[PDB]
């Protein structure tokens, strides 16, 4: 019921067109629960690592 998402303060912005690369990554690269490549009304994706996942 609180903050559980955090951008991977280290990752090459690329390879990201399926809930896997960033996903599986966070799911292990940062002992996370799940992740994904989220944009930002600018056209730039980022490896967002979710630990709680709603």
Task: Output the DSSP codes for 1-54.
Answer: ----EEE-SS--S---SSTTHHHHHHHHHTS-SEEEEE--SSS--EEEEESS--
**Cα 43 from Cα 52, distance rounded (Å):** 26
**Cα 36 from Cα 48, distance rounded (Å):** 5
Domains and CATH numbers, the chain: 2-54 (3.30.30.10)
Side-by-side strand order, sheet with 34-38: 5-7, 46-50, 34-38
């Amino acid at each position: 019921q609180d903050k559980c998402k955090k951008v991977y303060e280290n990752y090459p912005v690329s390879k990201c067109q399926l809930a896997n690369q960033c996903n599986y990554d966070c799911k292990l690269d940062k002992h996370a629960r799940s992740g994904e490549c989220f944009y930002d009304e600018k056209r730039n994706l980022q490896c967002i690592c979710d630990y709680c996942e709603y």
